[PDB]
Symmetry: C2
Subunit: 612 residues, 2 copies
């Protein structure tokens, strides 16, 4: 068996006796439809029956078994939004092989990290991925991961051609899924080392079943998959696995641009899709800028999740797109909260839903680690029938990631409604949520420190209108580095392109801890007092004052030194702010003083005085 942290016996029995764990493999999602001719997968021009989908999975599993792949073993897969992802996935389940489905965005350091951990016998990737265009990386990778005995490549026309395996008809094949209470596959986690989440058939099949129920997926569902298909969101909430379980149709898209997706939604009459907020921002702008909503008329449900949706953006969706919103707050660790189809337009705009299972136990903790009453803000704790009880082979990290009662901390600050619902309030874990992709501050900092000129490094999130958050790397350096240089360096480290720092700030020093690392939990306050210290400098010339004043007033006109600044749109609150700062030098300056004579002349007269 593959090592994972089991639920304690009383919980396993409880979950089994309640019917959350049904003891069926995940392969059951497909094989129940193994004779259906209705369409399961649409990928560009290609369409697969359910019966085609199952046959192909059977075929691939058989081909892999003929090449010496065995049950209990492990696989590394890098396939993006293509039909083969699902064929591969069920093929491995049928074979009883446990896959890690890497992001198509993942590069050499991610692929090495996953491979090192699972010791994979099987590697399936895609010659359309830049690492796999030629054969040089593949040669090194297999050499450096000697467990790898078989390699199958999409878009290849040689001995490793994945299409061959998939097209070769099974011959006396019996599926051998791993037991339902054992690992089915490894999910990815959002620390400086990639952490894997073992999922069992029981916990994961439950998370999908219950999602199908809540979202009412049916044979009639036509679901657009345009975010990354391998992510838990797109795979299971209810995602494409939900669609398959319901006997519906999955429509695949390379990316969630409006350009690509709008005509697909019309062509195939998508009624449900899952987006991340930047993509939502994108679709709204496209319509306002001319795109026809009529293309999206068939659309019945837009899922938004992965990141914090503003009430304002949340609210434009029925109004502008023309369909229901569902907020979905979820995590690969387990817990998924949905709003409901029968929720009020009120509940749907402001809250992130409540847990999909009634045995999902969630409780807001404080820093001491105490339950707070309903309505108070703090740490999210949780265990349940589909929340794991331990990262793959990480006992030290698990000792720190769970409480005494086996509750897992999600690193999310939340408040619970009177009525059960959850509204996300903040985060305490150290990560950037860049448009839905998670970045470990720890990981990026170690790579930055690898550069000769970098001595100290800190990665923090900054707000961005489209992306939600972005990365900011502060650096203390031996020699000045351009941001383009830092991004170039990290590219060379073979890391995913979204992990490239969005801004770089070189600085002369940074708050340090004891071990010689950067003190982040003051870098909060340290940063604030640097920005507010340049803004505390009282101008030393009339010119320097003009420089502070102009950006506060109207862009259109530029005033004369003796002009009434209010006639150029200087508002009284900004005036009050200036007063509060200048009073720190001349302590007789207040709002009333400035407002009596609101000109640069008169303010320079005051400002240029000697401190008395």
């Amino acid at each position: 068996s593959i090592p994972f942290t089991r639920w304690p016996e009383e919980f396993a029995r409880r979950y089994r006796e309640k019917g959350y764990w049904q003891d069926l493999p995940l392969t059951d999602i497909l094989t129940r439809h193994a004779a259906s001719d209705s369409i399961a997968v649409i990928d560009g021009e290609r369409q697969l029956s359910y019966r085609e989908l199952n046959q192909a999975a059977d075929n691939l599993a058989c081909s892999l078994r003929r090449q010496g792949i065995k049950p209990g073993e492990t696989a590394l897969v890098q396939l993006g939004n293509v039909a083969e992802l699902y064929i591969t996935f069920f093929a491995l389940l049928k074979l009883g092989v446990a896959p890690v489905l890497a992001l198509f965005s993942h590069q050499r350091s991610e692929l090495n990290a996953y491979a090192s951990q699972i010791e994979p016998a099987l590697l399936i990737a895609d010659r359309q991925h830049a690492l796999f265009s030629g054969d040089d990386f593949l040669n090194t990778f297999v050499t450096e991961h000697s467990s790898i005995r078989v390699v199958q490549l999409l878009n290849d026309s040689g001995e490793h051609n994945l299409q061959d395996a998939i097209n070769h008809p099974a011959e006396d094949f019996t599926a051998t899924p791993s037991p339902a209470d054992e690992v089915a596959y490894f999910q990815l986690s959002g620390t400086g080392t990639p952490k894997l989440i073992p999922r069992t058939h029981n916990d994961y099949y439950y998370s999908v079943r219950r999602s199908v129920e809540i979202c009412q997926f049916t044979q009639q569902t036509r679901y657009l998959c345009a975010i990354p298909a391998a992510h838990n969101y797109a795979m299971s909430s209810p995602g494409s696995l939900g669609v398959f379980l319901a006997g519906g149709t999955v429509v695949l898209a390379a990316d969630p641009s409006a350009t690509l997706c709008f005509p697909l939604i019309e062509k195939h009459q998508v009624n449900v899709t899952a987006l991340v907020p930047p993509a939502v921002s994108l679709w709204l702008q496209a319509l306002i800028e001319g795109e026809s909503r009529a293309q999206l008329a068939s659309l019945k449900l837009l899922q938004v999740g992965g990141a914090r949706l503003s009430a304002t953006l949340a609210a434009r969706i029925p109004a502008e797109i023309g369909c229901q919103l569902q907020q979905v707050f979820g995590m690969a660790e387990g817990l998924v909260n949905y709003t409901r189809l029968d929720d009020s337009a009120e509940k749907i705009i402001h809250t992130q839903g409540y847990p999909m299972c009634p045995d999902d136990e969630v409780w807001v903790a404080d820093a001491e680690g105490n339950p707070l009453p309903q309505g108070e803000v703090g740490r999210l704790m949780t265990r349940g029938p589909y929340t794991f009880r331990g990262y793959y082979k990480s006992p030290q990290h698990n000792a720190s990631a769970f409480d005494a009662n086996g509750f897992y901390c999600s690193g999310d600050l939340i408040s619970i409604d009177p009525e059960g619902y959850i509204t996300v309030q903040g985060r305490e874990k150290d990560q950037i949520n860049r448009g839905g992709e998670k970045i470990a501050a720890e990981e990026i900092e170690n790579l930055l420190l690898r550069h000769p000129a970098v001595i100290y490094a800190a990665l923090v999130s900054m707000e961005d209108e489209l992306m939600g958050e972005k990365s900011c790397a502060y650096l203390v350096v031996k020699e000045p580095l351009r941001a383009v240089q830092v991004r170039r360096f990290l590219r060379e480290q073979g890391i995913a392109e979204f992990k490239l720092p969005d801004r770089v700030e070189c600085v002369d020093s940074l708050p340090l801890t004891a071990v010689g690392k950067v003190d982040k939990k003051q870098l909060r306050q340290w940063l604030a007092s640097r920005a507010s210290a340049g803004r505390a400098s009282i101008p030393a010339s009339k010119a320097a004052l003009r420089e502070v004043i102009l950006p506060l007033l109207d862009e259109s006109d530029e005033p004369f030194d003796d002009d009434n600044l209010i006639d150029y749109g200087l508002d009284s609150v900004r005036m009050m702010a200036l007063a509060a700062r200048w009073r720190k030098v001349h302590g007789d300056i207040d709002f009333v003083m400035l407002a009596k004579n609101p000109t640069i002349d008169a303010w320079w007269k005051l400002l240029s005085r000697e401190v008395k």
Copy 2:
């Protein structure tokens, strides 16, 4: 009797029975504390006890009676955050004269407008007001409003000296307040092209004060800092200074809600409650973050925020950065005031604007056709109740369009109601700017504009401002071109409140006109988003477009990978959607395969095929 719209008989009767209307005059707020030596008012270095407050009020009313003022008559007052405002107010209730309390920032246009309506016997004002420094304005105003027989001036050393009157001891004086079911005074609307007046009776208005005190638990230990405009209904009655007076506490007055004035005042006097508008919260928060000690605000236990929308982000910061409970206050001078409760969860307080203060505040949510909506749906605020007016003063035409058949008023706000009944404002329907809590009517500002010779069409709309909440933008089509400073100056020459001068002015070629002469605003919003929607010529022009999207730091070569300069994929996807309308073969994929200025220029510069 001063003309106003009575509540129906069944309503009046019900309101008395349930205890809402008590049939006490507003003066009872003071006279119930007339032997109390406890401090009622602190204005700079001056302190007035309750018995003094009452005494001064009696003195003023007595003098005004000596100079010929009679109950039933009306009064125009412009006094800002001074102790005299309360002394005056209570003197006028005692005499039974009904004031309009103007804003200290109100100028010549607003003052002529209120006077025009109330036909005032009495004018009181402040020589510290630029209109009243000398006697030029005062001389015209009195002449242009002949009803005025008596003028009294704060900061004056002549016969019109307000302090002479306040200091002259009362003789043979007994109060003659107007009957409790009649107008006590006129409150100002948000606003229409004409300033509207809200007649408040001693019954409905006292009730809003009493019930507000119960909710915010004001008592004799309450020490309320009044630093926003004291005459406004918020600072005056929600529970405001009248609440403080009712509960026997202390009002501490300030001229403005800046931190540097206010922080010291809260420490020195151990102020425990205060009422802010959102910009002033942003203001106090920044001063602290930039060095002001929070120890100065230790005594502070409650902070009211209202008048405009408070964001949840800002709301969440208050208990954490100021160290006192937050209370959201959604009120209108028409009546309805909702409050969050002291025993609310932090969740409730942050996200909601509270529920109504009165059990018989009937609030429902109407769709645009006028039909009720299920709890939790979004729409128009309809409301009536025992302290919500039934009509503006002498405005039968407007009142017909302002109330529905059953006497529900329409606040012009967009709201949703959560299960528990809490209210969250979702938007606004009426045509006004909410500029840090001061209400600007677009209509009013537009007629003034159209009076400028170069101006042929005008539209005032609101725009977001991180600090003020909303600012004002004036779109004009004009004969000869106008600078913003010219427009603001011209408006000043019209004598309007400074806050009503347009924050922005964009001159434009044309404007969507209403089919009946004016400018179409509910088409202007979408006219606007489709005028700026239009907006690459050369490689140079492409470059002009790309750079602001990428990293501000470095500058790229034409063959550089723009992702190495931090151009994210969503901005890239958006660029594609835009460029597809010319070259119908461009998608995100095409742009991303080769993200350079050179490659993109090559594609853009192709002939359309």
